Subunit: 214 residues, 4 copies
């Protein structure tokens, strides 16, 4: 699967749509504004279009390593602010995935070079929930960290100035934390949904105690 193969597939796929479904390229030319912002991992095990049955132009996307929303990452923060203040999306979905190489490397902590600084933020979370994790069986720990990561990133995004001041002026925006597994591509909703300052907090706290129950 060389590069010249990608060029040639694209050419066959485009040449077939031009003549056979003129549809497509008009839907895109409709240039309709996105309504969701997907914040996912660069592993991109199962593309978000495939996972949700969303069409091109309906998803705004950011992908870094391990779905993080770092308080001071201007790259991710810039995606969010464009999305919210300019594109006026209504839904921001942060979605992790069980078996994430990033999450796993955060715990095993191999010497991988520069990436380990990025992965320190996920380690912060593993130690933050030491007790919660030490109480559940050794074999369900990684998956749970993957879930906590996503809860924490939802927490962070809600505390961003972008989101706090978007809610405060009345604009409708809803954050969601999800995860999918690769055994079945099924999206599990983590029930940490937020539409203002209050739910954000409630749902996050509820989210941590719901985990303490195992």
């Amino acid at each position: 699967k060389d590069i010249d193969t990608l060029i040639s597939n694209n050419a066959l796929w485009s040449k077939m749509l031009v003549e056979e479904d003129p549809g497509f390229f008009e839907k895109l030319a409709q240039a309709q504004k996105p309504r969701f912002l997907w914040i996912g991992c660069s592993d991109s095990r199962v593309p978000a279009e495939r996972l949700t049955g969303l069409e091109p132009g309906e998803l705004f996307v950011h992908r870094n390593v391990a779905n993080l929303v770092i308080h001071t990452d201007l790259n991710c923060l810039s995606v969010v602010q464009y999305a919210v203040d300019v594109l006026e999306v209504e839904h921001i979905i942060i979605c992790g995935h069980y078996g994430c190489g990033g999450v796993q490397a955060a715990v095993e902590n191999p010497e991988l070079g520069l990436i380990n600084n990025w992965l320190l933020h996920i380690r912060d979370i593993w130690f933050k929930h030491s007790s919660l994790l030490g109480e559940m069986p050794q074999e369900r720990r990684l998956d749970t960290l993957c879930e906590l990561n996503v809860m924490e990133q939802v927490y962070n995004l809600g505390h961003s100035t972008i989101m706090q001041s978007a809610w405060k002026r009345g604009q409708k925006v809803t954050i969601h934390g999800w995860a999918y597994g690769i055994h079945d591509g099924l999206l599990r909703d983590l029930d940490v949904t937020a539409t203002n300052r209050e739910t954000l907090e409630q749902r996050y706290r509820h989210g941590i105690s719901n985990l303490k129950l195992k």
Copy 2:
């Protein structure tokens, strides 16, 4: 399409796939290492997987507003480092797209807030090629800027410590600059493909100088 319709489509898609033709989840479980890193725009007008016929898991993906590789952006540089040092991808494709809202905002320069700062890196490019751009009919400057911007991020990518150090140690990594439009989804190779320090410079230079003809 609102949030209840995405949770439903996914359960239909999943389970529907598993019961009639399940050998897909098998192949994913093997978690084979991706060979391409795709750095694209958050707009994602046409997803990379649909452009190229790359399957799930065949590509690492980063997306930010206007597919930028900023010298000092630890987000994109972490993706790139992980992909190169740890996953050992052979190809990095930076793909821009004609009509990008980022690229347009960069030139029109409306008051958008936080995002404008990120966009200054594109504005830098606009003024860098003010002569080239000025000797060209007004109506072509946006599409030209779009290519110029990809050419510059590729150039940026190969100058990073990560790429300089992969090439020097003999690792095989090739960097590409592409762009597509929405009228036909057809990929154009902007022809700045680089496999070492030397071709990086020569390709960049001819990339610019062959625009100055056209």
Copy 3:
């Protein structure tokens, strides 16, 4: 004191010192690399040279709001990698200060604009130590947070790939965590001094537990 006056203070002072102490500049013209790196706050309540009696060129300096060492801030990590890998400093001091405007604004959390995102890193610490902080009076929480901040930034610095690879190639580098008051200018060693991976973890746990005693 407007600009006109800073230029004249500087002119007078330069003229004066060229007539009456040319050695001042003879000392500075030398290949003498700094021995210490100072990470302090942009408040710069009492400068570092006057706290310690350190002289021109004996220290490398970084200052940001609340003297943070964020896992993924390339600004501060660039200053560190340069100091350690290139200038080969032997001591890194992170110094906070009681009354720090940055810390105070973290807790009181006014709507200050863009800076609030920077400060969420301190709020993380305010909530990490929610119990210890919660069981003291309101007035004393600000000074404890200040020392807690300094301890947590030493921790982060110790965990950074730069310190990690430095310590394991057997380079001599000591991290310190200090704080000064503005009733004295007296430097309290917060007693988290780290020479290696091992002392780093010990001293950090020592630090937090010894605070929780009082």
Copy 4:
């Protein structure tokens, strides 16, 4: 010097000041907002206090390697936004210095590791002003680069959203670009002083033009 010798230097100084220059902690007790924000290099060869005679509490300070203001460095833009919006400083001075190790490395491009990424922002400037620099004696090129660096950082600072929305809402803020050398400590004004976006641009254009005639 030694770490014990920094603590006792300090201890000594803290009594020989508490009632011998008694009006030091009298001044700082009044936690008065600085009027100046100084953005300088981590080299800090001659401190800003000693150069200008500015007293403790009168300046806010940011230092990074080679005194940069990157469009998307949140560390430096955070200091700036807090300085301007919260502290309401009237003056921001970016000061570079001749013989800056950061500028020199940018040109000569040794492999120093992580810092090279940061210095690529200076390499861009080196190349941006290729003709200017080539039309001068080679011996003069590093000094001119150091100055062009300050000018370009000033340009960046004035184009950030923090500065644009401060000048649009009538707040009085003046940006200046200075440099000094170690041979006499004498500040040199590079004359890019701007109080709004219109003079920012004019001042930059003539900054570059007057170098060309010289």
